[PDB]
Ligand binder design. Sequence first.
Ligand SMILES: O=C(O)C1(c2ccc(-c3ccc(Cl)c(Cl)c3)c(F)c2)CC1
Ligand SMILES: O=C(O)C1(c2ccc(-c3ccc(Cl)c(Cl)c3)c(F)c2)CC1
Lengths: 115, 116, 116, 115
Amino acid sequence: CPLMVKVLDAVRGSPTINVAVHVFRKAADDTWEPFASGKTSESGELHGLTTEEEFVEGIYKVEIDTKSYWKALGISPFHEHAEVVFTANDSGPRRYTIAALLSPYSYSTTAVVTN
Amino acid sequence: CPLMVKVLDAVRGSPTINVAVHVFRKAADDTWEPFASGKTSESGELHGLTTEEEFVEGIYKVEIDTKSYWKALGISPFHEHAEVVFTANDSGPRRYTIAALLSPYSYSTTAVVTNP
Amino acid sequence: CPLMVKVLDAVRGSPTINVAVHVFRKAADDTWEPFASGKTSESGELHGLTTEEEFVEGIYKVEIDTKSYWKALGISPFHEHAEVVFTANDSGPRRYTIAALLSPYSYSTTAVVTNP
Amino acid sequence: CPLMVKVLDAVRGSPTINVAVHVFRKAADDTWEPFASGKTSESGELHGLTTEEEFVEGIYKVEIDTKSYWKALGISPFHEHAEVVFTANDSGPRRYTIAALLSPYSYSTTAVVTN
Ligand SMILES: O=C(O)C1(c2ccc(-c3ccc(Cl)c(Cl)c3)c(F)c2)CC1
Ligand SMILES: O=C(O)C1(c2ccc(-c3ccc(Cl)c(Cl)c3)c(F)c2)CC1
């Protein structure tokens, strides 16, 4: 599993459950081509987005649909989504975890990159 | 000054100086149209981006050129840039500060929305 | 003004107003001695805590009374308070801003150390 | 495992390995009594600090020795440590994960509290 996303809720002190995540890859014409999508589980994790064969070098965008998450809890948040844009696999295959912590008017994101 | 950006460096504990910031507005066709841009000052702030008359309700994207900032420091960064996408509304408190705290593999951002 | 504190609310997107902040200095016996205190202003800032003559090198603790802030908003918080413990040195850039961003179950803090 | 600590490094994009963690519990005289301690593993996690029987109600302080971590990597950081102080188990036993993200001049911490 070369690309995983884990999301926490800073208001309730819990995993962020059932947040939609869309991954895009920049094409030659510089548009964002849809690459993979899914929803976080009860543990706040999203596994199984892609495979090592499919996850080639490129510039990827991970979009976390935070507005839908807050609106479904009856909260009006500030951001449309949380986005993370990065070059991947440019020195060979790596494994990426995108971690995020969400508040209605704020988010933090970090990356854990292994072997 | 309805929209301001402030950027901090979590590695050096300093304002983020001379970093390019681009603001875009989402058009009817759903593309991002350039709206305003600048470079942060010695205090890490970018003022005077827009005016009240120009800053109408809609969806805006603030892009911070973090990759060039880290590279100028000889530091290898993770992100291509930091992006903040939000709706401006008139029922809200008028003045928007977008704040960001930068590390090579992480960033945090918050909005401070205040005042009459 | 060698030491300043600024506090932001990540739930409401606003400065954290009227929150108690206590500063302590570590004594020779290793206890924490009261040093300075105040409440944040309408802009979430606390200025005038100390002076250059009083703010000597040593270990300091800044305690932000976050629990009372959230309770006043009717919100159940996790932390008893937020604490920031650091050494002040004279080889460093003189002015210290302690910044904190608050959520009910989380806080982030950074230091901005600048200027002659 | 009712109390766990997980720490990430925002500079290197990796788990924070071998950071010391000390837990204290406030005594009746309001002093901080040592309660448990350990070091994070290669995954950045610290398990096995306490048991459900020992982890009674009280005010606990989790101190993450971030200065020793940065100094061992040849970096001079700002903070002495990162501290998290909270009341635990006041509505019955819960499981607590204290998560932290570290930079030389900054840290963030969040809590995940379950059942
Ligand atoms: O004038 C402001 O808004 C300042 C400020 C800017 C940013 C923050 C800040 C603090 C913590 C985080 Cl995680 C983030 Cl994203 C931003 C902060 F606490 C203060 C003090 C410089
Ligand atoms: O298994 C993980 O990776 C977990 C985790 C997820 C997120 C973080 C985290 C903690 C703080 C910040 Cl600011 C950010 Cl962006 C992420 C954290 F410290 C830990 C513990 C749930």
